[PDB]
């Protein structure tokens, strides 16, 4: 029996255009879809289905084989009441406190559960054709699809039964389901932790579930503080940059002072001129460093608001990032380090989304410092995650990069 | 004549909507007579069927007979039914491009006869297509009909016809994977690499398979021969071109004449290299009426004359060879104009094209070149399913200096430098550190929002100062004026401190082109300097 799914009132199903694909990705998808159709997982559809969701082909996490990725971002936004209010999966606060967190792909579990007949039409997708030789190949889902947030929401009851003996035997292990993955955290020694993962894989293997470094280590996640340089000689220019960077942090951190340092900039002096540091300025500098190395007082995650992630290209394969709900009220800051700009940016996006899932159980909306078309053409060539976050394109403000440098 | 025995596509109305109930307006006797004759013939052919009085739906009918002709045509106004009919999926994602066609030994055109009338309509939906032929002066009940096939002008016909052809071709495609069949509207373009005799054997077998499903196609004597005139193109056995282009010679050009000329030049630009439309497009800027005469500027006259020389002799493109790479080359033509050619064997182009600089932007040639590469990459994946190898007029060192210093993630797929001037370069660079022995200008710009009057100025470490008044200005323009002042009054080496993130952001991206007269003046100054260092301080 199927769980009846309803759309949010006033909104219709997704009607998103299919992005052009290379010949090797089209052939990969045709082969995967031919096989899924034989297995009854999907069915060819008629023109009376006016819905569409984009489809892509990516390289797997564990192998060189092609895998189908459906971008259900619109269908997910349009079904939010079902997967978040009606069948919401609660997020554990202990997951980010674990020594090791292992991510296991469990998307193959959903192909067993059939999808409600009246909802299937909303899962429509099209395999495009080179030079528009033929009209695309149109299909819809007969079972819970990978990428749709309603799939873990409906499978939740079955996942609880599959995991019950493992959780009873290991009460200190935290298991969290997010979309197609299980997040498994423990405080065990790395060898005992890996042994418990291999044990959990055997439990999933009994139900047909044959399943970034190896593990994530959230207890070692330490914020990228606002860096104030340690100098022997201080020019007028260095003081100006420090005042600008402290003026920025004073709007976020309660207690930032700049009066004594700001006084040193009296006049219209040459940028290269050396200025000696006073006792009051040196004390103020050390008190600011102490505040910057601690979390932001007064900033809390509001579950009713979206998370935002901003990224800045710093040069030499270094990228900085911040996550917040209200501009510049930073919930987390970090850095990503390394082949090419687009590849590095996708890797950083996936790393930040994964941390966001561990900490808050949700993906942030990204502000990407790239041209919309460049990103739209190449992001798929390097993507390895089975989820896709929301993103928009920004023109990185001057000095925003400078303050987080 | 035949109506396909294919399974019908279930059709629905929009949620909460009933079928149309539009009153039939009384018609003249002449029109009623023509409609009765047309409808009797269609009813005999199975296309429409008489209905009882139980059906409450109605759609208006009309009859039109041209002055030159003795032929009457039936016109049904499906506007109301189309408004109430469900949405359908898009027919095609794009249109085939001739450059994406391969070199097949034989190619055949099979146009389906009476396409919509050869496909049945969902039985449960037929009732919504009800129409009435009114009696003389609407005195007595009219003659009522409903469609049994896809009606002309109804919303679902193009999608339902296409899906019916796809379903029908499915088994023939599985059992003949090496035969090419392009689907386009009511046509099938069939190609193969078999010898002339066995190709006709496959064509007859295809025509016969189609016939088994109610679709009639032209026989060997009635099928078209090359060159095929398709959608503004000419397709020949080993080359393709655009249909003849006639550039008119007029004493006075109107907005309408210029718009038609730009359309024709844009269409020719997909195979004629070097076509330009910037100056002609500039003439179309304004609120000018269609018949308003626009005098040609000297620049538009020069551009038109250069286009005429490009089109004086025919130019053709070649077909695609899937076993060879695609090469794309781009050239800068000046004033934000870019031209490109795509070939596999030099220099036999499959197609050409152009790219134009974005309007109202502070930009440079490196950015424009990156945008043109992106546009070409997208177009190539659609036509051929793969990205071309690029030959660009930019040094690897110039690109490396740009991408490693730019705040935005940027990338160009596999490319090689080609020395085809004008080459792409950055015309100035800003210093990374404050200059020693150079004067530091602390610039400031402000504008009163109430009066729109502003002041632009500076104070230096050397005691120099200046203040200038500006009328009908903004904070942004006074901040740029303040920077320009410092550039004008300083020597070859200068340090500039500003509180304008806006101005800093524009200059840090090394623009050489701008819509703004003020940004262009800042550029001329920046280029002539030896060392410029720009720093920012909070207000
Ligand atoms: C190799 C060719 N031989 C010819 O005789 C000739 F005139 C043209 C070509 C190019 N060509 C190569 N391949 C196809 C095909 F669609 F792929 C299929 F027939 F094989 C063509 O068929 C088209 C393709 C298109 C359009 F889809 F591009 C329009 C028309 C028309 N009219 C035709 C005939 C086609 O024209």
Short mmCIF file of N, CA and C in Angstrom, two decimals, chain A residues 253-395:
data_model
loop_
_atom_site.label_atom_id
_atom_site.label_comp_id
_atom_site.label_asym_id
_atom_site.label_seq_id
_atom_site.Cartn_x
_atom_site.Cartn_y
_atom_site.Cartn_z
N UNK A 253 30.64 40.66 16.38
CA UNK A 253 31.10 40.36 17.73
C UNK A 253 30.91 41.46 18.78
N UNK A 254 30.15 41.18 19.85
CA UNK A 254 29.97 42.18 20.92
C UNK A 254 31.25 42.40 21.75
N UNK A 255 31.76 43.63 21.76
CA UNK A 255 32.95 43.96 22.53
C UNK A 255 34.15 44.44 21.73
N UNK A 256 34.05 44.43 20.39
CA UNK A 256 35.16 44.88 19.54
C UNK A 256 35.40 46.39 19.71
N UNK A 257 36.65 46.80 19.99
CA UNK A 257 36.98 48.22 20.15
C UNK A 257 38.02 48.64 19.11
N UNK A 258 37.92 49.88 18.62
CA UNK A 258 38.86 50.36 17.60
C UNK A 258 39.40 51.79 17.87
N UNK A 259 38.84 52.50 18.87
CA UNK A 259 39.21 53.88 19.24
C UNK A 259 40.73 54.18 19.28
N UNK A 260 41.52 53.38 20.02
CA UNK A 260 42.96 53.58 20.18
C UNK A 260 43.77 53.39 18.88
N UNK A 261 43.39 52.41 18.06
CA UNK A 261 44.07 52.15 16.80
C UNK A 261 43.68 53.22 15.77
N UNK A 262 42.38 53.59 15.74
CA UNK A 262 41.80 54.60 14.84
C UNK A 262 42.47 55.98 15.03
N UNK A 263 42.89 56.29 16.27
CA UNK A 263 43.57 57.53 16.63
C UNK A 263 44.92 57.64 15.92
N UNK A 264 45.62 56.50 15.70
CA UNK A 264 46.93 56.47 15.03
C UNK A 264 46.87 57.00 13.59
N UNK A 265 45.69 56.93 12.96
CA UNK A 265 45.47 57.38 11.59
C UNK A 265 45.14 58.88 11.50
N UNK A 266 45.59 59.68 12.49
CA UNK A 266 45.35 61.13 12.52
C UNK A 266 46.21 61.85 11.48
N UNK A 267 45.54 62.52 10.56
CA UNK A 267 46.20 63.26 9.50
C UNK A 267 45.94 62.69 8.12
N UNK A 268 46.81 63.03 7.19
CA UNK A 268 46.75 62.61 5.80
C UNK A 268 48.16 62.07 5.51
N UNK A 269 48.59 61.05 6.26
CA UNK A 269 49.94 60.51 6.11
C UNK A 269 50.14 59.61 4.89
N UNK A 270 51.42 59.42 4.50
CA UNK A 270 51.83 58.55 3.39
C UNK A 270 51.50 57.10 3.81
N UNK A 271 50.98 56.27 2.87
CA UNK A 271 50.59 54.88 3.15
C UNK A 271 51.73 53.99 3.67
N UNK A 272 52.95 54.21 3.15
CA UNK A 272 54.17 53.47 3.52
C UNK A 272 54.87 53.97 4.80
N UNK A 273 54.33 55.01 5.45
CA UNK A 273 54.95 55.58 6.63
C UNK A 273 54.77 54.71 7.86
N UNK A 274 55.87 54.45 8.58
CA UNK A 274 55.82 53.61 9.78
C UNK A 274 55.23 54.39 10.94
N UNK A 275 54.28 53.79 11.66
CA UNK A 275 53.64 54.40 12.82
C UNK A 275 53.82 53.48 14.05
N UNK A 276 54.42 54.01 15.13
CA UNK A 276 54.64 53.19 16.33
C UNK A 276 53.34 52.89 17.08
N UNK A 277 53.22 51.68 17.62
CA UNK A 277 52.01 51.29 18.34
C UNK A 277 52.04 51.70 19.81
N UNK A 278 50.96 52.35 20.26
CA UNK A 278 50.84 52.77 21.65
C UNK A 278 50.45 51.57 22.56
N UNK A 279 50.55 51.75 23.89
CA UNK A 279 50.21 50.71 24.86
C UNK A 279 48.70 50.41 24.81
N UNK A 280 47.88 51.46 24.60
CA UNK A 280 46.42 51.39 24.52
C UNK A 280 45.98 50.67 23.24
N UNK A 281 46.71 50.89 22.13
CA UNK A 281 46.40 50.25 20.85
C UNK A 281 46.80 48.78 20.87
N UNK A 282 47.95 48.46 21.48
CA UNK A 282 48.45 47.09 21.59
C UNK A 282 47.56 46.24 22.50
N UNK A 283 46.99 46.84 23.57
CA UNK A 283 46.10 46.11 24.49
C UNK A 283 44.77 45.82 23.78
N UNK A 284 44.24 46.83 23.08
CA UNK A 284 43.00 46.75 22.31
C UNK A 284 43.12 45.67 21.22
N UNK A 285 44.31 45.57 20.59
CA UNK A 285 44.61 44.60 19.55
C UNK A 285 44.56 43.17 20.10
N UNK A 286 45.13 42.96 21.29
CA UNK A 286 45.15 41.64 21.94
C UNK A 286 43.75 41.24 22.44
N UNK A 287 42.97 42.22 22.94
CA UNK A 287 41.60 41.96 23.41
C UNK A 287 40.65 41.62 22.24
N UNK A 288 40.93 42.16 21.05
CA UNK A 288 40.14 41.88 19.86
C UNK A 288 40.44 40.46 19.38
N UNK A 289 41.73 40.05 19.42
CA UNK A 289 42.18 38.72 19.01
C UNK A 289 41.50 37.65 19.86
N UNK A 290 41.37 37.90 21.19
CA UNK A 290 40.73 36.97 22.13
C UNK A 290 39.26 36.76 21.78
N UNK A 291 38.55 37.84 21.39
CA UNK A 291 37.14 37.76 21.03
C UNK A 291 36.96 37.00 19.72
N UNK A 292 37.81 37.31 18.72
CA UNK A 292 37.78 36.69 17.39
C UNK A 292 38.05 35.17 17.40
N UNK A 293 38.81 34.68 18.40
CA UNK A 293 39.07 33.24 18.51
C UNK A 293 37.94 32.46 19.25
N UNK A 294 36.86 33.16 19.66
CA UNK A 294 35.73 32.53 20.35
C UNK A 294 34.46 32.61 19.47
N UNK A 295 33.42 31.78 19.73
CA UNK A 295 32.19 31.86 18.92
C UNK A 295 31.46 33.21 19.07
N UNK A 296 30.56 33.54 18.12
CA UNK A 296 29.84 34.81 18.19
C UNK A 296 28.74 34.78 19.25
N UNK A 297 28.82 35.70 20.22
CA UNK A 297 27.82 35.79 21.27
C UNK A 297 26.56 36.40 20.70
N UNK A 298 25.44 35.72 20.89
CA UNK A 298 24.15 36.21 20.43
C UNK A 298 23.63 35.64 19.13
N UNK A 299 24.44 34.82 18.44
CA UNK A 299 24.01 34.24 17.17
C UNK A 299 23.51 32.80 17.33
N UNK A 300 22.25 32.57 16.99
CA UNK A 300 21.61 31.26 17.09
C UNK A 300 20.87 30.89 15.84
N UNK A 301 20.84 29.60 15.55
CA UNK A 301 20.14 29.06 14.40
C UNK A 301 18.63 29.09 14.70
N UNK A 302 17.86 29.64 13.76
CA UNK A 302 16.42 29.78 13.81
C UNK A 302 15.88 28.75 12.81
N UNK A 303 15.30 27.63 13.29
CA UNK A 303 14.82 26.58 12.36
C UNK A 303 13.79 27.00 11.31
N UNK A 304 13.08 28.10 11.55
CA UNK A 304 12.09 28.60 10.60
C UNK A 304 12.72 29.43 9.45
N UNK A 305 14.06 29.67 9.47
CA UNK A 305 14.71 30.47 8.43
C UNK A 305 15.71 29.66 7.61
N UNK A 306 15.93 30.07 6.35
CA UNK A 306 16.88 29.42 5.47
C UNK A 306 18.32 29.76 5.86
N UNK A 307 19.24 28.82 5.62
CA UNK A 307 20.64 29.05 5.85
C UNK A 307 21.23 29.58 4.55
N UNK A 308 22.21 30.46 4.63
CA UNK A 308 22.88 31.02 3.48
C UNK A 308 24.37 30.75 3.59
N UNK A 309 25.02 30.39 2.47
CA UNK A 309 26.45 30.18 2.48
C UNK A 309 27.07 31.08 1.44
N UNK A 310 28.12 31.80 1.82
CA UNK A 310 28.82 32.67 0.89
C UNK A 310 30.25 32.16 0.73
N UNK A 311 30.80 32.20 -0.49
CA UNK A 311 32.15 31.73 -0.75
C UNK A 311 32.98 32.82 -1.42
N UNK A 312 34.26 32.96 -1.04
CA UNK A 312 35.14 33.91 -1.69
C UNK A 312 36.35 33.15 -2.18
N UNK A 313 36.76 33.43 -3.41
CA UNK A 313 37.95 32.89 -4.03
C UNK A 313 39.11 33.73 -3.46
N UNK A 314 40.04 33.11 -2.75
CA UNK A 314 41.17 33.82 -2.15
C UNK A 314 42.46 33.75 -2.95
N UNK A 315 42.52 32.87 -3.93
CA UNK A 315 43.71 32.71 -4.75
C UNK A 315 44.53 31.52 -4.30
N UNK A 316 45.38 31.01 -5.21
CA UNK A 316 46.27 29.87 -4.96
C UNK A 316 45.55 28.64 -4.42
N UNK A 317 44.35 28.38 -4.95
CA UNK A 317 43.52 27.25 -4.55
C UNK A 317 42.89 27.34 -3.18
N UNK A 318 42.80 28.55 -2.62
CA UNK A 318 42.21 28.75 -1.30
C UNK A 318 40.84 29.43 -1.44
N UNK A 319 39.86 28.96 -0.70
CA UNK A 319 38.53 29.52 -0.74
C UNK A 319 38.02 29.69 0.69
N UNK A 320 37.43 30.85 1.01
CA UNK A 320 36.86 31.06 2.33
C UNK A 320 35.34 31.01 2.27
N UNK A 321 34.68 30.73 3.40
CA UNK A 321 33.24 30.67 3.41
C UNK A 321 32.63 30.96 4.76
N UNK A 322 31.36 31.42 4.74
CA UNK A 322 30.62 31.75 5.94
C UNK A 322 29.21 31.24 5.74
N UNK A 323 28.57 30.83 6.82
CA UNK A 323 27.21 30.36 6.82
C UNK A 323 26.46 31.24 7.83
N UNK A 324 25.31 31.78 7.44
CA UNK A 324 24.51 32.64 8.31
C UNK A 324 23.03 32.62 7.90
N UNK A 325 22.16 33.21 8.74
CA UNK A 325 20.74 33.35 8.43
C UNK A 325 20.42 34.82 8.18
N UNK A 326 20.99 35.70 9.00
CA UNK A 326 20.87 37.14 8.84
C UNK A 326 22.24 37.58 8.41
N UNK A 327 22.32 38.42 7.37
CA UNK A 327 23.64 38.83 6.87
C UNK A 327 24.67 39.20 7.92
N UNK A 328 25.78 38.49 7.80
CA UNK A 328 27.02 38.61 8.54
C UNK A 328 26.91 38.15 10.01
N UNK A 329 25.75 37.60 10.43
CA UNK A 329 25.60 37.05 11.78
C UNK A 329 25.96 35.56 11.59
N UNK A 330 27.29 35.30 11.44
CA UNK A 330 27.91 34.00 11.15
C UNK A 330 27.68 32.86 12.14
N UNK A 331 27.03 31.81 11.67
CA UNK A 331 26.79 30.59 12.44
C UNK A 331 28.06 29.71 12.36
N UNK A 332 28.81 29.77 11.22
CA UNK A 332 30.04 29.02 11.01
C UNK A 332 30.87 29.66 9.91
N UNK A 333 32.18 29.67 10.08
CA UNK A 333 33.11 30.13 9.06
C UNK A 333 34.09 28.99 8.83
N UNK A 334 34.73 28.99 7.67
CA UNK A 334 35.71 27.97 7.35
C UNK A 334 36.54 28.30 6.14
N UNK A 335 37.31 27.33 5.68
CA UNK A 335 38.11 27.47 4.48
C UNK A 335 38.19 26.13 3.75
N UNK A 336 38.41 26.18 2.45
CA UNK A 336 38.56 25.00 1.63
C UNK A 336 39.84 25.19 0.82
N UNK A 337 40.69 24.16 0.78
CA UNK A 337 41.94 24.24 0.01
C UNK A 337 42.12 23.02 -0.89
N UNK A 338 42.81 23.20 -2.04
CA UNK A 338 43.05 22.11 -2.97
C UNK A 338 44.14 21.16 -2.46
N UNK A 339 41.28 20.91 -9.11
CA UNK A 339 42.36 21.31 -10.02
C UNK A 339 42.09 22.70 -10.64
N UNK A 340 40.96 22.85 -11.38
CA UNK A 340 40.58 24.12 -12.00
C UNK A 340 39.55 24.86 -11.11
N UNK A 341 39.27 26.15 -11.39
CA UNK A 341 38.36 26.97 -10.59
C UNK A 341 36.97 26.40 -10.41
N UNK A 342 36.36 25.88 -11.48
CA UNK A 342 35.02 25.31 -11.37
C UNK A 342 35.05 24.06 -10.54
N UNK A 343 36.05 23.20 -10.73
CA UNK A 343 36.17 21.95 -9.98
C UNK A 343 36.37 22.21 -8.47
N UNK A 344 37.25 23.16 -8.12
CA UNK A 344 37.53 23.55 -6.74
C UNK A 344 36.27 24.10 -6.08
N UNK A 345 35.52 24.94 -6.82
CA UNK A 345 34.29 25.53 -6.31
C UNK A 345 33.23 24.48 -6.04
N UNK A 346 33.10 23.46 -6.91
CA UNK A 346 32.12 22.39 -6.66
C UNK A 346 32.49 21.58 -5.44
N UNK A 347 33.78 21.30 -5.27
CA UNK A 347 34.30 20.55 -4.14
C UNK A 347 34.01 21.30 -2.83
N UNK A 348 34.22 22.63 -2.84
CA UNK A 348 33.96 23.47 -1.68
C UNK A 348 32.45 23.48 -1.35
N UNK A 349 31.59 23.59 -2.38
CA UNK A 349 30.14 23.60 -2.19
C UNK A 349 29.68 22.30 -1.52
N UNK A 350 30.20 21.16 -2.02
CA UNK A 350 29.83 19.85 -1.46
C UNK A 350 30.31 19.69 -0.03
N UNK A 351 31.50 20.19 0.28
CA UNK A 351 32.05 20.11 1.63
C UNK A 351 31.22 20.95 2.62
N UNK A 352 30.85 22.18 2.22
CA UNK A 352 30.04 23.08 3.04
C UNK A 352 28.63 22.55 3.24
N UNK A 353 28.03 21.97 2.19
CA UNK A 353 26.67 21.41 2.32
C UNK A 353 26.67 20.22 3.30
N UNK A 354 27.69 19.36 3.23
CA UNK A 354 27.84 18.20 4.10
C UNK A 354 27.95 18.66 5.56
N UNK A 355 28.77 19.70 5.84
CA UNK A 355 28.88 20.22 7.21
C UNK A 355 27.56 20.78 7.68
N UNK A 356 26.85 21.47 6.79
CA UNK A 356 25.56 22.05 7.08
C UNK A 356 24.54 20.95 7.44
N UNK A 357 24.54 19.82 6.72
CA UNK A 357 23.65 18.68 7.00
C UNK A 357 23.95 18.07 8.40
N UNK A 358 25.23 17.94 8.74
CA UNK A 358 25.66 17.39 10.02
C UNK A 358 25.24 18.30 11.20
N UNK A 359 25.55 19.60 11.10
CA UNK A 359 25.23 20.59 12.11
C UNK A 359 23.74 20.89 12.22
N UNK A 360 23.06 21.26 11.11
CA UNK A 360 21.64 21.65 11.20
C UNK A 360 20.61 20.73 10.54
N UNK A 361 21.05 19.75 9.78
CA UNK A 361 20.12 18.85 9.09
C UNK A 361 19.47 19.47 7.88
N UNK A 362 20.13 20.46 7.29
CA UNK A 362 19.62 21.12 6.10
C UNK A 362 20.74 21.76 5.28
N UNK A 363 20.49 21.94 4.01
CA UNK A 363 21.47 22.52 3.09
C UNK A 363 21.31 24.04 3.01
N UNK A 364 22.42 24.78 2.88
CA UNK A 364 22.30 26.24 2.74
C UNK A 364 22.02 26.65 1.28
N UNK A 365 21.65 27.92 1.07
CA UNK A 365 21.45 28.44 -0.28
C UNK A 365 22.75 29.16 -0.56
N UNK A 366 23.44 28.75 -1.64
CA UNK A 366 24.74 29.32 -1.93
C UNK A 366 24.73 30.59 -2.76
N UNK A 367 25.71 31.46 -2.48
CA UNK A 367 25.97 32.69 -3.20
C UNK A 367 27.33 32.41 -3.83
N UNK A 368 27.33 31.96 -5.09
CA UNK A 368 28.53 31.56 -5.82
C UNK A 368 29.23 32.68 -6.59
N UNK A 369 30.54 32.86 -6.33
CA UNK A 369 31.28 33.92 -7.03
C UNK A 369 31.72 33.45 -8.42
N UNK A 370 30.76 33.26 -9.32
CA UNK A 370 30.99 32.80 -10.68
C UNK A 370 29.86 33.33 -11.62
N UNK A 371 30.07 33.20 -12.95
CA UNK A 371 29.12 33.61 -13.99
C UNK A 371 28.14 32.47 -14.07
N UNK A 372 26.83 32.79 -14.02
CA UNK A 372 25.75 31.81 -14.07
C UNK A 372 25.93 30.74 -15.15
N UNK A 373 26.24 31.15 -16.39
CA UNK A 373 26.42 30.23 -17.51
C UNK A 373 27.62 29.31 -17.38
N UNK A 374 28.77 29.81 -16.85
CA UNK A 374 29.96 28.98 -16.65
C UNK A 374 29.64 27.87 -15.66
N UNK A 375 28.99 28.23 -14.53
CA UNK A 375 28.61 27.26 -13.51
C UNK A 375 27.61 26.29 -14.08
N UNK A 376 26.55 26.79 -14.73
CA UNK A 376 25.50 25.93 -15.32
C UNK A 376 26.03 24.91 -16.33
N UNK A 377 27.08 25.28 -17.07
CA UNK A 377 27.67 24.35 -18.05
C UNK A 377 28.56 23.27 -17.45
N UNK A 378 29.40 23.64 -16.47
CA UNK A 378 30.38 22.71 -15.94
C UNK A 378 30.16 22.07 -14.57
N UNK A 379 29.33 22.63 -13.67
CA UNK A 379 29.19 22.04 -12.31
C UNK A 379 28.96 20.54 -12.27
N UNK A 380 28.22 20.00 -13.26
CA UNK A 380 27.87 18.57 -13.36
C UNK A 380 29.04 17.65 -13.61
N UNK A 381 30.11 18.16 -14.22
CA UNK A 381 31.31 17.38 -14.53
C UNK A 381 32.09 16.95 -13.32
N UNK A 382 31.89 17.61 -12.18
CA UNK A 382 32.65 17.32 -10.97
C UNK A 382 31.78 16.92 -9.78
N UNK A 383 30.45 17.11 -9.87
CA UNK A 383 29.51 16.77 -8.82
C UNK A 383 29.52 15.28 -8.48
N UNK A 384 29.56 14.96 -7.20
CA UNK A 384 29.55 13.58 -6.74
C UNK A 384 28.47 13.29 -5.69
N UNK A 385 27.86 14.31 -5.11
CA UNK A 385 26.81 14.13 -4.13
C UNK A 385 25.49 13.76 -4.80
N UNK A 386 24.59 13.11 -4.04
CA UNK A 386 23.30 12.72 -4.60
C UNK A 386 22.20 13.76 -4.36
N UNK A 387 22.53 14.85 -3.64
CA UNK A 387 21.65 15.98 -3.40
C UNK A 387 22.22 17.19 -4.18
N UNK A 388 21.43 18.24 -4.31
CA UNK A 388 21.84 19.46 -4.97
C UNK A 388 21.26 20.60 -4.16
N UNK A 389 22.10 21.52 -3.68
CA UNK A 389 21.57 22.65 -2.92
C UNK A 389 21.08 23.76 -3.85
N UNK A 390 20.34 24.73 -3.28
CA UNK A 390 19.90 25.90 -4.03
C UNK A 390 21.11 26.83 -4.17
N UNK A 391 21.20 27.56 -5.27
CA UNK A 391 22.29 28.51 -5.48
C UNK A 391 21.84 29.70 -6.30
N UNK A 392 22.52 30.82 -6.12
CA UNK A 392 22.36 32.06 -6.85
C UNK A 392 23.77 32.60 -7.11
N UNK A 393 23.90 33.56 -8.01
CA UNK A 393 25.21 34.06 -8.43
C UNK A 393 25.49 35.45 -7.96
N UNK A 394 26.67 35.66 -7.38
CA UNK A 394 27.01 36.95 -6.82
C UNK A 394 28.31 37.54 -7.37
N UNK A 395 28.46 38.86 -7.21
CA UNK A 395 29.62 39.63 -7.65
C UNK A 395 30.44 40.09 -6.43
#
